[PDB]
Design a protein around this nucleic acid. Structure first.
Ligand SMILES: [K+]
Ligand SMILES: [K+]
Ligand SMILES: [K+]
Ligand SMILES: [K+]
Ligand SMILES: [K+]
Ligand SMILES: [K+]
Ligand SMILES: [K+]
Ligand SMILES: [K+]
Ligand SMILES: [K+]
Ligand SMILES: [Mg+2]
Ligand SMILES: [Mg+2]
Ligand SMILES: [Mg+2]
Ligand SMILES: [Mg+2]
Ligand SMILES: [Mg+2]
Ligand SMILES: [Mg+2]
Ligand SMILES: [Mg+2]
Ligand SMILES: [Mg+2]
Ligand SMILES: [Mg+2]
Ligand SMILES: [Mg+2]
Ligand SMILES: [Mg+2]
Ligand SMILES: [Mg+2]
Ligand SMILES: [Mg+2]
Ligand SMILES: [Mg+2]
Ligand SMILES: [Mg+2]
Ligand SMILES: [Mg+2]
Ligand SMILES: [Mg+2]
Ligand SMILES: [Mg+2]
Ligand SMILES: [Mg+2]
Ligand SMILES: [Mg+2]
Ligand SMILES: [Mg+2]
Ligand SMILES: [Mg+2]
Ligand SMILES: [Mg+2]
Ligand SMILES: [Mg+2]
Ligand SMILES: [Mg+2]
Ligand SMILES: [Mg+2]
Ligand SMILES: [Mg+2]
Ligand SMILES: [Mg+2]
Ligand SMILES: [Mg+2]
Ligand SMILES: [Mg+2]
Ligand SMILES: [Mg+2]
Ligand SMILES: [Mg+2]
Ligand SMILES: [Mg+2]
Ligand SMILES: [Mg+2]
Ligand SMILES: [Mg+2]
Ligand SMILES: [Mg+2]
Ligand SMILES: [Mg+2]
Ligand SMILES: [Mg+2]
Ligand SMILES: [Mg+2]
Ligand SMILES: [Mg+2]
Ligand SMILES: [Mg+2]
Ligand SMILES: [Mg+2]
Ligand SMILES: [Mg+2]
Ligand SMILES: [Mg+2]
Ligand SMILES: [Mg+2]
Ligand SMILES: [Mg+2]
Ligand SMILES: [Mg+2]
Ligand SMILES: [Mg+2]
Ligand SMILES: [Mg+2]
Ligand SMILES: [Mg+2]
Ligand SMILES: [Mg+2]
Ligand SMILES: [Mg+2]
Ligand SMILES: [Mg+2]
Ligand SMILES: [Mg+2]
Ligand SMILES: [Mg+2]
Ligand SMILES: [Mg+2]
Ligand SMILES: [Mg+2]
Ligand SMILES: [Mg+2]
Ligand SMILES: [Mg+2]
Ligand SMILES: [Mg+2]
Ligand SMILES: [Mg+2]
Ligand SMILES: [Mg+2]
Ligand SMILES: [Mg+2]
Ligand SMILES: [Mg+2]
Ligand SMILES: [Mg+2]
Ligand SMILES: [Mg+2]
Ligand SMILES: [Mg+2]
Ligand SMILES: [Mg+2]
Ligand SMILES: [Mg+2]
Ligand SMILES: [Zn+2]
Lengths: 208, 124, 138, 83, 104, 150
RNA sequence: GGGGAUUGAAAAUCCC
RNA sequence: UUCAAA
RNA sequence: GAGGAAGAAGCCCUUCGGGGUGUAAACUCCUGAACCCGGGACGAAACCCCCGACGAGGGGACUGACGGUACCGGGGUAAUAGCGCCGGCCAACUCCGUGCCAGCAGCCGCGGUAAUACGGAGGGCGCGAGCGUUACCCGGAUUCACUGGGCGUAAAGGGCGUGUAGGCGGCCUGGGGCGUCCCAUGUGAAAGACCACGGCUCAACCGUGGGGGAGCGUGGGAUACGCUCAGGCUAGACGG
RNA sequence: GCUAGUUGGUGGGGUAAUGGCCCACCAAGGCGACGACGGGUAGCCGGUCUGAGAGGAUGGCCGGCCACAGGGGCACUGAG
């Protein structure tokens, strides 16, 4: 089961703020806000020049932790990326960005990814009409991701979909806040995203 | 060598010598203790490593190591062997798997329990 | 006795160039002459010419180098940095057009001998033929 | 004798047959002489039945004896339709 | 097609049968070098026609006996014991390598 | 302007009565990630001073790497002593496939795609020097052209 | 079989 | 004499 | 799942000021694995019968082990977490306990009173219904080097010669076309692998379609190099 | 170093059919350092794992071929 445990601690081990909570991570409290040092009894102690390896490990752990995906699944995507034509780095990101659970989150249907995930597992999500509770489901270009008719009235749904009014969204995505529909226009360009991650090191980590 | 020589003699392929010849290159092998001596290490170590001679089912009679803090092995304890040398005791190439057969698991063990065959203790 | 006249020529050239000779003779043979044509046209050697020495037919090979250099060791760069024999007596080497090698992403060459004559890897590739991969030069 | 019958491909609870020509004596999913079509029982695709009728007509011309089911499918593709 | 091989007659000591040495040439599967290799076929000569030293063609045929599965198709080049000689010598060297040895 | 990547630091020893007497050696690469790299090996009583000395040496002893879209103009092999280095060009997406020593020199040279292989003695010092020489030996079509003209 | 003396701790040596 | 001590 | 303290208690550490576990928990609010109720499959349309002519073609009927399963619709509970590591290689450090003991150890090595290496604890790293161990194969190993290694002193030139087989063979011309090269053509089962679409909500799994050729056979063609047969040449060798 | 049905021939026998497959006579011949004979191990392949590749390793599952049916021999029946 995708991690599930103290999360605003991973932010602390990566020395960078990851959004694994949506809000709370915006209001002075993602911990990174005054307490940016690693978790644990030695968190405040001076760090030692990390090994080329350490650097590469933490980088992958960053990107991977951002999407709350497992090593098993993360690796399988990367291997797929390698094989495919074109720059593995971007292509990899493109694939991570195509996970239904992620897209749900991108469209704002949920505040964080872990929430977006649950929304999927519980059928509150629809792809071209049909229900789909597979958070790893790969959204293709042209697919319409909406909210289940029966779920459109849920308290949590309104709140999030409300806050989405006026809010802009991914240049590769499009949100019709009305009927609570969204459309995966195209695979995001590396230029499209802006994750605190140097995918180049990630490729290197697996090249070892 | 010349190509003609290579055509004539060719290169010889490397053959691998097994380090755990306790036959059938099986993953483990069971046996019966014959002696449960204690032995002394080679320089620069000193201590009384626990060891046992095992009359193996592979038709072999080798000496295996008894890992962990204390054991319960005697002149007739049936045990399972796994292979793994004891760098300090020349001639000791296998370990005895604690937790299988007559080999009790280490008691009061709390960390590396898989090894030493120690069941998960209860937390009241 | 020379076991490989072509290898001999290739070396005579390799040797002369490492000490910056002007020319350098090599006992003449049509086949050697053929390779020199390529070498010349490709621009590795200024050019070559038939010459009689002691009554015997040779081939003056006029080598060429780069310009004098700066700092310690002003000795010019070699135009012919590398020149290695591939196919040899007792270990002959052939290639089909599809197996002709790409010597230094093209910045170099490979002289093969095809039934359509001695050609550079590019020339051969063009006429779509393969043959004995004689040497590589760069 | 030689026959025209279904060879089973696909997976568990997901059959996908192959209209094939083969010796009556060969194991069902063994080496066939020729593939002349395919058939999907659950018709999970609009293209669940195809049959190289020209070829089917060929083997029949030389002796291939079709299974009852094999015959059924051939008919659908108008193999015997002599209109 | 019925395989046709060319070789040398290195034995006419049988009734209606000749031994034909056939050389083969090919690149070594790993080392490249073109290498030779030979094999002797017992060919059928019912007319006791061909003799020691002839270069005949041999053709794949209906078994004539055990060993014999080739018939002499024709003569390519008559007389030339140089080849036979080579074979005979190589065979004589054998008399050497063993428990004793033969003169070189 | 110039980046600094420390390849390795070591503490050698010499002998005098009384005992050992340490010294420190530092291998530092300097580069602009745009075709310019330099190697430096400096030794001194203290590490810090050694590193600096290295960096300083690194700046003299620079090499003009002819990058071609993140890669090398062609493949090359160079032996420095018993150490050999194999540099092979690659298409984008490949990355810098190399041992710590070569990559450090390769990345600061502004190389982003390359196939590498360390042969013979993998003595870092010499492997680094083999690398510099390899790069230094790289030629461009224009260059070859210039040479072959006359 | 310690328990001391000695040892950095031992072996050894001298003590009970 | 053993192991280890700058 | 979201919210949730400048941050409970407990345990750990402390320079006794404080620091960790830690938004983690508690608690609030959402969702609703399990489970209950209802519906409930595809896979099965032939053989056969009737019309027609036992044909083509039309009609008709009987069949589901899986399974009341899958799937669908209602209702609906906060609801398993382990295992291995933290001296270097190798991501992760502190206290206490033990003393060359008890023990660890893949390799280098740890332990003879301050042990990040033993055992425990707190903390941390890694992975997660799995995590480790053993065994075995390829890799790293250009460490048998075809690609891709060596032999003065590191392992390695035979004590020397004569010479058999074999391997290797200078310059020019011609015939042949065996090697070699080029073009067609046959063969190269299916599955697998690769690419592209598809079917199970995804995937695993599966279906359809698409290149991909090496090897060998056949038929043409080329002749630089190697080969072979002819004839020449003196610069190798031999002789006077 | 090996070989006497051993190698070959003529004529028979036998088979769906070639053949020392078997037999009767007649020849002395066949094979080997390009590894005969002997010993050890092993079912082969499509393929599988690994590897940048060349290679290396492997042949469970599925597909093809072969061999066997407690261990040895033999035939009868039959398109087999
Ligand atoms: K050199
Ligand atoms: K009908
Ligand atoms: K203590
Ligand atoms: K510890
Ligand atoms: K290995
Ligand atoms: K010697
Ligand atoms: K000719
Ligand atoms: K007969
Ligand atoms: K194989
Ligand atoms: Mg890629
Ligand atoms: Mg080899
Ligand atoms: Mg064993
Ligand atoms: Mg010790
Ligand atoms: Mg341990
Ligand atoms: Mg040469
Ligand atoms: Mg050269
Ligand atoms: Mg070569
Ligand atoms: Mg080669
Ligand atoms: Mg005769
Ligand atoms: Mg006969
Ligand atoms: Mg130094
Ligand atoms: Mg330049
Ligand atoms: Mg170079
Ligand atoms: Mg060297
Ligand atoms: Mg080495
Ligand atoms: Mg002392
Ligand atoms: Mg003494
Ligand atoms: Mg000691
Ligand atoms: Mg929470
Ligand atoms: Mg409720
Ligand atoms: Mg049905
Ligand atoms: Mg029935
Ligand atoms: Mg009727
Ligand atoms: Mg329901
Ligand atoms: Mg429901
Ligand atoms: Mg409710
Ligand atoms: Mg570390
Ligand atoms: Mg202590
Ligand atoms: Mg450790
Ligand atoms: Mg799982
Ligand atoms: Mg690797
Ligand atoms: Mg190897
Ligand atoms: Mg080795
Ligand atoms: Mg070699
Ligand atoms: Mg070596
Ligand atoms: Mg010596
Ligand atoms: Mg020596
Ligand atoms: Mg000598
Ligand atoms: Mg010649
Ligand atoms: Mg010759
Ligand atoms: Mg000729
Ligand atoms: Mg030819
Ligand atoms: Mg073909
Ligand atoms: Mg196929
Ligand atoms: Mg799909
Ligand atoms: Mg296919
Ligand atoms: Mg001609
Ligand atoms: Mg040739
Ligand atoms: Mg014999
Ligand atoms: Mg007869
Ligand atoms: Mg007959
Ligand atoms: Mg016989
Ligand atoms: Mg024999
Ligand atoms: Mg032979
Ligand atoms: Mg015998
Ligand atoms: Mg044998
Ligand atoms: Mg067997
Ligand atoms: Mg078998
Ligand atoms: Mg390799
Ligand atoms: Mg095999
Ligand atoms: Mg099989
Ligand atoms: Mg039997
Ligand atoms: Mg049988
Ligand atoms: Mg039997
Ligand atoms: Mg039985
Ligand atoms: Mg029986
Ligand atoms: Mg019958
Ligand atoms: Mg019968
Ligand atoms: Zn956070």
């Amino acid at each position: 089961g995708r991690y599930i445990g103290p999360v605003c601690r991973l932010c602390r081990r990566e020395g960078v703020k990851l959004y694994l909570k949506g809000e709370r991570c915006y209001s002075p409290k993602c911990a990174m806000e005054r307490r940016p040092y690693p978790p644990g009894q030695h968190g405040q102690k001076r760090a030692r020049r990390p090994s080329d390896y350490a650097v590469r490990l933490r980088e992958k752990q960053k990107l991977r932790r951002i999407y709350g995906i497992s090593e098993r699944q993360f690796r399988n995507l990367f291997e797929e990326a390698s094989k495919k034509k074109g720059v593995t780095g971007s292509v990899f990101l493109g694939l991570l960005e195509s996970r239904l659970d992620n897209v749900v989150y991108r469209l704002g249907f949920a505040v964080s990814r872990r929430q977006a995930r649950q929304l999927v597992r519980h059928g509150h999500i629809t792809v071209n009409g049909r229900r789909v509770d597979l958070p790893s489901y790969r959204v293709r270009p042209g697919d319409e991701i909406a909210v289940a008719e029966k779920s459109r009235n849920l308290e949590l749904i309104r709140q999030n979909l409300e806050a989405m009014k006026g809010r802009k969204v991914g240049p590769w995505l499009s949100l019709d806040v009305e009927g609570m529909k969204g459309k995966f226009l195209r695979l995001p360009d590396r230029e499209d995203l802006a994750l605190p991650v140097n995918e180049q090191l990630v490729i290197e980590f697996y090249s070892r | 060598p010349t190509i003609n020589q290579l055509v004539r003699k060719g290169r010889e392929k490397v053959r691998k010598k097994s380090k755990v010849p306790a036959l059938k290159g099986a993953p483990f092998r069971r046996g019966v203790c014959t002696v449960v001596r204690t032995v002394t290490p080679k320089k620069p170590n000193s201590a009384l490593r626990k060891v046992a001679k095992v009359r193996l089912t592979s038709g072999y009679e080798v000496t295996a190591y008894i890992p962990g803090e204390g054991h319960n092995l005697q002149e007739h304890s049936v045990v399972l062997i796994r292979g793994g040398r004891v760098k300090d005791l020349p001639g000791v190439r296998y370990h005895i798997v604690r937790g299988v057969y007559d080999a009790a698991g280490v008691k009061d063990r709390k960390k590396s329990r898989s090894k030493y065959g120690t069941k998960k203790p209860k937390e009241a | 006795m020379l076991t490989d006249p072509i290898a001999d020529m290739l070396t005579r050239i390799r040797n002369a160039t490492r000490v910056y000779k002007e020319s350098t003779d090599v006992p003449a043979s049509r086949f050697k002459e053929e390779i020199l044509r390529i070498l010349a046209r490709e621009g590795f050697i200024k050019g070559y010419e038939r010459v009689d020495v002691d009554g015997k037919p040779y081939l003056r090979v006029y080598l060429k180098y780069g310009p004098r250099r700066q700092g310690p060791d002003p000795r010019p760069e070699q135009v012919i940095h590398h020149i290695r024999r591939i196919s040899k007596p007792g270990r002959r080497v052939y290639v089909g057009v599809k197996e002709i090698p790409r010597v230094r992403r093209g910045l170099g060459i490979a002289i093969l001998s095809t039934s359509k004559g001695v050609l550079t890897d590019r020339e051969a590739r063009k006429l779509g033929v393969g043959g004995e991969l004689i040497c590589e030069v760069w | 004798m030689v026959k025209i019958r279904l060879a089973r491909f696909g997976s568990k609870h997901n059959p996908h047959y192959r209209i094939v020509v083969t010796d009556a004596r060969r194991k069902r999913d063994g080496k066939y002489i020729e593939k002349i079509g395919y058939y999907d029982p659950r018709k999970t695709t609009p293209d669940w039945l195809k049959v190289d009728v020209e070829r089917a007509r060929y083997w029949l011309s030389v002796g291939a004896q079709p299974t009852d089911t094999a015959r059924r499918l051939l008919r659908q593709a108008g193999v015997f339709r002599q209109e | 097609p019925k395989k046709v091989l060319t070789g040398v007659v290195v034995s006419d000591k049988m009734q209606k049968t000749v031994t034909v040495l056939v050389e083969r040439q090919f690149p070594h599967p790993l080392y490249g070098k073109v290498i030779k290799r030979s094999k002797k076929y017992l060919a059928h000569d019912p007319e006791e026609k061909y003799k020691l030293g002839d270069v005949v063609e041999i053709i794949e045929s209906r078994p004539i006996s055990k060993r014999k599965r080739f018939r002499v198709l024709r003569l390519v080049e008559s007389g030339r014991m140089d080849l036979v000689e080579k074979y005979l010598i190589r065979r004589q060297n054998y008399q050497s390598l063993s428990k004793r040895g033969g003169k070189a | 302007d110039f980046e600094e990547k420390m390849i390795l630091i070591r503490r050698t020893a010499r002998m005098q009565a009384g005992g050992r007497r340490f010294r420190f050696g530092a291998l530092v690469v300097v580069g602009d990630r745009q075709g310019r790299v330099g190697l430096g090996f400096g030794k001194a009583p203290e590490v810090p001073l050694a590193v600096q000395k290295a960096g300083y040496y690194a700046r003299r002893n620079m090499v003009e790497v002819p990058l071609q879209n993140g890669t090398i103009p062609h493949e090359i092999e160079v032996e420095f002593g018993a150490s050999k280095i194999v540099l092979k060009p690659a298409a984008p997406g490949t990355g810098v496939i190399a041992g710590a020593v070569p990559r450090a020199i390769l990345e600061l040279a502004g190389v982003t795609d390359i196939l590498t292989k360390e042969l013979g003695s993998r003595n870092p010092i010499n492997i680094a020097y083999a690398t510099m020489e390899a790069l230094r030996q790289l030629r461009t079509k224009a260059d070859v052209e210039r040479l072959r003209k006359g």
